[PDB]
Ligand binder design. Structure first.
Ligand SMILES: [Zn+2]
Lengths: 267, 215, 49, 41, 99, 115, 122
């Protein structure tokens, strides 16, 4: 356990700060006087500093017991070869660096085929968690995969891929026939809802926002992570206007890199 | 055991005893048993009088604190502790249960049978103690110097060697001369000597630490 | 640092000439305490020297 | 704030005294300079 | 003058964070090397902006040499594809009479 | 063992500071009365330097309860991080070979750069 | 010609800069038999890095061999038969662009024919 082993740090610092502060109380009163020209700038500062250091000792004493309340509670030769592997984890963090994703790219101008089973292995990696959502991969038309996604009791989404990249994505509710009369997945239709049609535009702006020229897996992973915030729809008020409805519209627009529900007017 | 270091300008360091008390000679520290003889080990670089902070010019602390080959790459400081920590606790071995009989300033004589030995601090290198006790006797202390007083310096290996120490010495030294020519297992003369095979060895397991004999 | 009303002196290795780390941080909580007393840069510089 | 009134009462009793800086010195100086350490170089 | 040298001086400083024999030094060390290294690089651009604007205005011929150079290299790659396209055009010929 | 031994040091420490400041206040009046002109027999002088034996040692017996615990929460946890002993004997020498290989590869790249 | 060499020097500076970020991108992928491939990859990368370093030193000397005329002549103040070739080939390449434009327009008609085929195929 480490909650007590790190909560002890404040108390073990506070007792030494008590020793140092009472030493200050002793020697500052033992320092005598430093007039610095006028006496009224000293003798009125005498009671000021005498209150200051004594009250510092007092507040240190006081904050000692609120930390004390929250806390609770071959022989040494082979011990040395144990923690070095644990500090090798820090050594892994030694060469990380904070440069991360950001680079200094210029223009990319000078002077392919992948199996659908690779797409299936891609979709199997992230479907394994988030059990409230489901993924149903299908290719009734060509090698391109379009997927049915159910979101608890809320949303039914068709997500069309092509050429291993993104093609389209249309979201509807939970009580509609997303299939056709023949039973195939619907391709060209409309969600028949003002809020859903409004947020499909946000989805189209988001798919053109996540731009990786080589790595579309993180593009679609960030897309579905963004979509995961939309299971909180009709349940969270807007962050700037307080109320849900802006002209009758609840907040939906999650901002880029900061996922919280907004409107177009609410930015 | 404790160390005091007091830095100062122009490369000056004041070296106190640490384990002493500055102020009380009637009273000391409970957990830090006092550490004598420290200044002599300082003065070669150059009772309760080692409690002074000793001026050094930031340069003998180099050779003292540096891990150096043992005269394992163990420092003259930590070797000297090992010479000390054997010297403290061998006494605490000898006084209990065996026969204790010695008369010297700091040297200790264990008056048992089979060439009772007397051990003092070595003068050329104080970092190791030196024991004084036919020709196969002397190899035992060099093995004791290299291994039982090995620079890991843990206490319980002395428990075996103190309890380790007649004709049993004759075979084991033949095994000891053999082992020195090329551990946790000693030898005994159930037979007359130690041949190349079938010796009545005396081992000691780490997890057991019991009197082990194999024949 | 205004909400601290303090200074957060960072003891740090610079240049390709060192061993494992900066290693001045044993006295880290102690060097901060002394400059509570003093607004004098030489007090910091000379203790290092 | 709690159990500090001897320290508060000592300074008001010892105020308007000409031996103030020496009375406090006499009653206090050996306690901190002995155990906690010597003065600086 | 010798601007590559102080540029490549910051190169081994970029290795100072990497090669040796509590985090705050690392964030500073990887920063000020890089920010001076982008400092030492962007000025070479402006130095190169100086050097070929010198060549741009002091003479008009190296402008039109490189203008011909880019269009000839466009002239080939234009021609490189069209009879490639034509050979390709010949490809779906027999692809389509398979029925 | 030390989990219940810590539970008595801290409440003893709080009152150790209390009796420390109480004997300090006992010394304060007795020593201020000597300085100015007024007479009072010291009797039980109750000198403070003995009482300081009680508190700092209780701050030290705290650390003996913590630092040994700092050892006690470490040694048993990482004793068997990586049941068959010879497999472990093989993987420790393999990993200590590879760690030195990457350690000298870092210096190999550094020496390829300069030096 | 020398302006092309200065452009080459600028692009090789960009090459070393991109080389630096690609080294930092590649090395950050490994922390503590898969290890051998990454180290061989980085060895080839640093070999190409050294080759690029020496070739930028070569082209830096090549661009620095010729400069007497200084800067501040460069600020634009308000106060032979190759040109015939340029003028004649500009409209030829424009005519080629238009000639392929009618062809791709015919292909546009073809693709507007073909997208209605699958539209009502069923
Ligand atoms: Zn809103």
């Amino acid at each position: 356990v480490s909650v007590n082993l790190e909560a002890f740090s404040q108390a073990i610092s506070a007792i030494q700060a008590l020793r140092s502060s009472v030493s200050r109380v002793f020697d500052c009163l033992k320092d005598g006087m430093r007039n610095k020209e006028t006496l009224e700038g000293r003798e009125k500062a005498f009671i000021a500093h005498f209150q200051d250091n004594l009250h510092s000792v007092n507040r240190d004493l006081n904050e000692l017991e609120r930390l004390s309340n929250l806390v609770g509670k071959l022989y040494s030769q082979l011990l040395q070869a144990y923690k070095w592997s644990n500090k090798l984890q820090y050594h892994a963090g030694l060469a990380s660096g904070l440069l991360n994703q950001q680079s200094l790219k210029r223009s990319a101008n000078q002077m392919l085929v992948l199996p659908p089973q690779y797409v299936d292995d891609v979709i199997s990696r992230i479907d394994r968690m988030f059990p409230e959502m489901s993924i149903h991969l299908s290719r009734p038309n060509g090698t391109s995969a379009m997927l049915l996604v159910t979101l608890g009791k809320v949303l039914k989404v068709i997500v069309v891929m092509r050429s291993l990249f993104i093609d389209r994505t249309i979201v509807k509710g939970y009580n509609e026939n997303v299939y056709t009369e023949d039973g195939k997945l619907d391709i060209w239709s409309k969600s028949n809802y003002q809020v859903f049609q409004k947020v499909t535009d946000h989805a189209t702006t988001a798919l053109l926002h996540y731009q990786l020229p080589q790595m579309p897996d993180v593009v679609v992973r960030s897309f579905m992570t963004w979509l995961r915030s939309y299971i909180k729809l009709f349940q969270a008020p807007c962050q700037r206007c307080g109320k849900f409805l802006q002209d009758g519209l609840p907040p939906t627009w999650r901002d880029f890199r900061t996922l919280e529900a907004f409107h177009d007017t609410c930015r | 055991y404790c160390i005091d270091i007091y830095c100062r300008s122009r490369g000056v360091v004041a070296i106190r005893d640490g384990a002493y008390s500055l102020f009380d000679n009637s009273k000391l520290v409970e957990g830090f048993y006092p550490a004598p003889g420290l200044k002599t080990f300082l003065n070669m670089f150059v009772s309760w009088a080692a409690s002074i902070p000793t001026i050094l010019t930031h340069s003998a602390l180099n050779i003292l604190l540096l891990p150096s080959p043992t005269p394992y790459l163990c420092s003259p400081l930590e070797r000297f502790l090992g010479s000390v920590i054997m010297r403290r606790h061998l006494q605490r071995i000898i006084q209990q249960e065996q026969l204790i009989n010695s008369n010297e300033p700091g040297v200790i004589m264990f008056k048992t049978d089979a060439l009772k030995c007397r051990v003092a601090l070595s003068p050329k290198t104080n970092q190791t103690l030196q024991l004084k006790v036919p020709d196969e006797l002397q190899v035992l202390e060099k093995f004791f110097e290299t291994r039982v007083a090995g620079p890991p310096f843990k206490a319980n290996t002395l428990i075996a060697f103190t309890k380790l120490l007649t004709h049993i010495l004759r075979d084991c030294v033949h095994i000891m001369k053999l082992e020195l020519f090329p551990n946790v297992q000693f030898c005994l003369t159930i037979p007359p000597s130690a041949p190349p095979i079938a010796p009545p060895g005396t081992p000691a397991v780490v997890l057991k630490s019991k009197m082990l004999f194999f024949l | 640092n205004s909400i601290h009303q303090k200074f957060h002196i960072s003891l740090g290795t610079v240049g390709p000439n060192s061993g494992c780390s900066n290693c001045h941080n044993t006295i880290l909580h102690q060097l901060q305490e002394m400059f509570n007393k003093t607004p004098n840069v030489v007090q910091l510089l000379q203790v290092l020297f | 704030q709690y159990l500090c009134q001897p320290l508060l009462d000592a300074v008001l009793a010892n105020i308007r005294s000409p031996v103030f800086n020496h009375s406090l010195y006499r009653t206090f100086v050996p306690a901190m300079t002995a155990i906690h350490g010597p003065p600086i170089t | 003058s010798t601007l590559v040298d102080e540029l490549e001086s910051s190169f081994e400083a970029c290795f100072a964070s990497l090669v040796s024999q509590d985090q705050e030094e690392i964030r500073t060390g990887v920063d000020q090397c890089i920010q001076k290294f982008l400092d030492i690089a962007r000025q070479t651009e402006c130095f190169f902006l100086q050097k070929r604007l010198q060549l741009s205005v002091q003479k008009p011929e190296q402008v039109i040499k490189e203008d011909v150079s880019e269009l000839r290299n466009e002239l080939q790659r234009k021609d490189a594809l069209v009879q490639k396209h034509l050979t390709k055009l010949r490809h779906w010929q027999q692809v389509l009479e398979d029925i | 063992d030390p989990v219940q031994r810590y539970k008595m040091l801290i409440p003893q420490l709080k009152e150790s500071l209390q009796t420390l400041m109480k004997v300090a206040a006992q010394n304060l009046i007795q020593n201020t009365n000597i300085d100015n002109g007024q007479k009072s027999s010291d009797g039980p002088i109750q000198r403070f330097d003995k009482c300081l034996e009680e508190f700092y040692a209780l701050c030290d017996q705290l650390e003996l309860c913590l630092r040994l615990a700092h050892e006690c929460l470490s040694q048993s946890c990482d004793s068997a991080k990586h049941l068959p002993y010879p497999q472990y004997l093989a993987v420790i020498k393999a990993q200590i070979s590879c760690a030195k290989d990457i350690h000298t590869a870092l210096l190999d790249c550094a020496n390829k750069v300069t030096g | 010609n020398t302006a092309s060499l200065c452009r080459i020097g600028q692009e090789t500076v960009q090459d070393i800069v991109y080389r630096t970020m690609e080294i930092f991108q590649l090395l950050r992928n490994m922390q503590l038999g898969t290890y051998q491939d990454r180290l061989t990859k980085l060895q080839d990368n640093l070999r190409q890095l050294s080759v690029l370093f020496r070739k930028l030193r070569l082209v830096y000397d090549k661009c620095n061999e010729n400069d007497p005329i200084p800067v501040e002549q460069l600020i634009p103040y308000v106060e032979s038969e190759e040109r015939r070739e340029i003028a004649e080939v500009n409209k030829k390449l424009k005519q080629k662009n238009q000639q392929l434009k009618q062809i791709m327009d015919q292909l546009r008609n073809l693709i507007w024919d073909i997208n209605a085929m699958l539209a009502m195929r069923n």
